[PDB]
Write a protein that binds this ligand. Structure first.
Ligand SMILES: [Zn+2]
Ligand SMILES: [Zn+2]
Lengths: 149, 129, 61, 84, 143, 36
RNA sequence: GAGCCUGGGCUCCGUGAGGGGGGAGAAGUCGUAACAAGGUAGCCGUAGGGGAACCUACGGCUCGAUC
RNA sequence: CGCUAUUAUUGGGCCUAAAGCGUCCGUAGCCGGGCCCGUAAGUCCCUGGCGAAAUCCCACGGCUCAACCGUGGGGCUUGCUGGGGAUACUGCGGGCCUUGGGACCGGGAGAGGCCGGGGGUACCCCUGGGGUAGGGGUGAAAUCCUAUAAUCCCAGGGGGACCGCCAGUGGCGAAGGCGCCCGGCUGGAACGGGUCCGACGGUGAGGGACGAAGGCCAGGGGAGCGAACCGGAUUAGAUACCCGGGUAGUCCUGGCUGUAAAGGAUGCGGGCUAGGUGUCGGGCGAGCUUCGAGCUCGCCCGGUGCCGGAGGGAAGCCGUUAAGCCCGCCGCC
């Protein structure tokens, strides 16, 4: 179920059990990598890169064609983000909410949303510390987080 | 959430057998489940189990014949010595040789009769009768 | 047997742009506007669910 | 802030009673803090005399309440006179 | 819901749970905290000696109707006074004041009183070191 | 207080809320008697 | 380093003029609160009142009958 | 001690009989998806050194048999420790995966919350014009208002609270709770998705936050209603029910209190065991069409109801939105 709301939604993707790439794919790995790099330089995120490749270029499951993922392709160059993307999205949401709440004190229903967002951030911090993508003493603090965004 | 898939497989088999089904599907597969089905087939409680490949894991298609009364997992997986099988038999089965206790050993998964022949112990996982 | 392995309902299309006659592979359930790589005109407007096609479908992969 | 319950009324010890000490402390704690200027918008307004308030940065000097720069009747008069 | 805890490495919490919920039983609570010992005038004995002060009669409970003969007894262990029942027909005639008396429990639910006479817990066994049954039956003479 | 829901039944009993009101007055008197 | 005195710390029992509620027992006196729509439907939370069971107000529930 | 499954590991209960914290977030702890490689801490087997005797079980022998005593074989001592072997499970270390979970895009739904602006009737009072003797209220009456002109009708000015019908068997929200219109700021969920990360999860003692009405503190306001109180009736009596008035309060701004039959009287997550018929949202496919963000039919996902077979239960009843069979964690009797 949902971690907070506890609603059993199922609105995801249904991928087939592929092992080899299909034949009707025009581009090749070396072109796909350049496309990724260019779309990144133009300021897009990884999910949007994938969505655009799928919709406009007809490239399914970039990992099938190129034997590696998008974040790997970008780390092999100097383009991968220092802070993971989920954490940054959530931190931006939190900063914007704190701004709103400084002007609207007694809303009192969005403060709970802020609490939930910070709980999610804390979970992800605990995971990334272990996995090593953050230093083991990294702490979330909105004061210092205003500058990250 | 999902903690133990063997228990779910066995409870599903039990219920489907109780209400009279011919075939049953076990969606998250595993080598433990495969070996347990092997033992059950050897001892004559099921027939013709097959493994199917979806890109996630394995699915198990099992046929039933009308020989299972109750099948269940044992939690916790108690350790058991070669000279203490009678207690657990009296606790889980209804007659002195009626059903099988499935044991995990360092030589593999087998029945307690074979494990006693070999003179070894292990961990209790499942029972069938 | 049963439908136990979920398979997608979407498909890929090979369409042709009316203006310049360029053939292009595209997705049926898009989430962004799809444009002709040559001209720049839009071929598939996104919606909720399946998208509206503004071109000629040749092949449905 | 060494005290739990008392504030600026710790100056005169166990004298004069609880309700009176509480009232004095409350009024003084509301008064002695800083307030927003109606001209520059910064928290720099202090009291000069009974009814006379002054900002320290810009030098704005206005007339107001005895212990707070604004009053409810003043607020309502401002609103009504702005509209009509 | 399933009964918790049930895991292989969860014995501490099981022991704590059982210890906690065992205090809701009165048998264990009383036996451990030693309350009967604190409230008993016989001080944990099966019998006790005493000196008589006053004969009395108690009215029986409804729907019965009768007067049960009893006697107030002062104990030599501690000086406390209790009430004891005199069983038999005419037993109260073979008992004078300042006579020595041996006291037993009367026999009742939870070491307490019996049916018709609530409030009494003890009965007489001996009068001046002679059995009251023999007194009643006439097979003896009290000194 | 902690309330037993059985007490709210009326059979051989006076109404629970009135009993609670009567209890809160006696406490008042006892504490006054001590003077704390 | 006993013992004596002395100033404190904790805690069980001991004893005390006299007051408060509690429980049984007889059922004596004033009323009729509850069980039927119990003759003002009943009950919870809060507050005020009244010889007593109880009355009233705001919010809630049906463990409420009928057209 | 047993009886007693009335202490429940084996092996108990929590809708109505005693019993689910008012709701949610999360710390320790407990429980944790699939594949490959290694290690051998737990775990299993074998063997060495220990765990005094008496006591316990069995056989033989001596007092007539026996109780008792003696010889020998096992056990008990809840276990400790030196080595060798094994690797299925747990643990530890390193890689891989995408189903569980989180992030993102798109077009839509909704009384979710905050701020500002604009209104709609109705009610109360005041000022003028008209008209003249009753109005109000009840089972029936009386207090009350009224010739200083009431009730009633007309024209105007002011004020405070609330937002009818449409309105549902509907919807949103963790619960409490949320209904005039327009605009801005903001929280969450469902659907569609060959998008991204790659087990990041469940529950949660202790701790925290929110939390109807009422009450308390400080300041403003105050139409209607109305605890207390003042009167009139009924009544054997009336501290009540009925009638006429009426303070606190009900409203706003900033705080405290932390309580309810805060109730589905039913703690949360995951898997399985026939369905039928309604309704809200999204999507797909067929047909009609006044071509409309329109109407009918079927299917998938998610919510929300009423029936009901097998099954369960002391029964009332529940019954894929279990009070059924399994895997977990907290609270209570
Ligand atoms: Zn073109
Ligand atoms: Zn200024």
């Amino acid at each position: 179920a949902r971690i907070h709301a506890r609603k059993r939604g199922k609105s995801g993707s249904k991928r087939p059990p592929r092992t080899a790439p299909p034949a009707w794919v025009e581009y090749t790995a070396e072109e796909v990598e350049a496309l990724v790099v260019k779309l990144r330089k133009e300021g897009y995120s990884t999910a949007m890169i994938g969505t655009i490749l799928r919709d406009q270029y007809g490239i399914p499951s970039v990992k099938l064609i190129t034997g590696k993922k998008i974040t790997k392709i970008l780390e092999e160059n100097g383009l991968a983000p220092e802070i993971p993307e989920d954490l940054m999205f959530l931190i931006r949401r939190a900063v914007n909410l704190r701004k709103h709440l400084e002007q609207h004190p007694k809303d009192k229903h969005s403060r709970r949303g802020l609490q939930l967002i910070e709980s999610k951030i804390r979970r992800l911090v605990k995971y990334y510390r272990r996995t090593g993508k953050l230093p083991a003493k990294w702490r979330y603090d909105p004061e210092q987080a205003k500058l990250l965004v | 959430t999902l903690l133990d898939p063997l228990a779910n497989a066995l409870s599903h088999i039990t219920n489907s057998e109780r209400v009279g089904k011919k075939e049953v599907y076990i969606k998250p597969a595993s080598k433990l489940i495969g070996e347990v089905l092997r033992v059950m087939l050897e001892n004559g409680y099921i027939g013709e189990f097959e493994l199917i490949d979806d890109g996630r894991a394995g699915i198990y298609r099992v046929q039933l014949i009308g020989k299972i009364n109750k099948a269940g997992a044992i939690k916790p997986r108690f350790p058991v010595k070669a000279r203490d099988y009678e207690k657990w038999e009296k606790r889980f089965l209804p007659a002195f040789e009626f059903g099988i206790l499935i044991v995990s050993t360092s030589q593999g998964v087998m029945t307690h009769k074979e494990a006693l022949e070999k003179g070894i112990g292990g961990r209790l996982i499942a029972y069938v009768y | 047997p049963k439908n136990l392995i979920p398979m997608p309902r979407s498909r890929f299309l090979r369409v042709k742009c009316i203006d310049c006659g360029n053939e292009q592979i595209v997705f049926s359930h898009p989430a962004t506007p799809v444009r002709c790589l040559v001209c720049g005109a839009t071929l598939v407007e996104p919606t909720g669910g399946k998208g509206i096609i503004k071109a000629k479908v040749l092949e449905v992969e | 802030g060494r005290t739990t319950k008392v504030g600026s009324a710790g100056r005169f010890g166990p004298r004069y009673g609880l309700k009176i000490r509480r009232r004095v402390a409350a009024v003084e704690a509301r008064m002695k803090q800083k307030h927003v200027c109606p001209v520059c918008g910064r928290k720099a307004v202090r009291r000069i005399s009974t009814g006379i308030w002054q900002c320290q940065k810009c030098g704005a000097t206005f007339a107001g309440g005895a212990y707070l720069p604004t009053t409810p009747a003043g607020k309502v008069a401002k609103r009504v006179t702005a509209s009509k | 819901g399933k009964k918790a805890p049930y895991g292989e490495f969860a014995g501490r919490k099981l022991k704590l749970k059982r210890k906690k919920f065992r205090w809701s039983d009165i048998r264990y609570k009383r036996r451990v905290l030693r309350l009967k010992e604190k409230s008993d005038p016989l001080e944990g004995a099966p019998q006790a000696r005493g000196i008589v002060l006053e004969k009395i009669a108690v009215e029986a409970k409804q729907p019965n109707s009768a007067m049960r003969k009893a006697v107030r007894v002062q104990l030599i262990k501690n000086g406390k006074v209790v009430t004891a029942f005199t069983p038999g027909d005419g037993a109260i005639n073979h008992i004078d004041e300042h006579d020595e008396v041996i006291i037993e429990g009367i026999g009742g639910p939870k070491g307490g009183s019996m049916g018709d006479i609530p409030g009494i817990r003890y009965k007489v066994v001996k009068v001046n070191r002679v059995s009251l049954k023999e007194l009643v039956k006439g097979r003896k003479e009290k000194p | 207080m902690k309330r037993r829901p059985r007490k709210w039944k009326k059979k051989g009993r006076m109404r629970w809320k009135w009993i609670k009101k009567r209890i809160r007055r006696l406490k008042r008197q006892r504490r006054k008697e001590r003077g704390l």
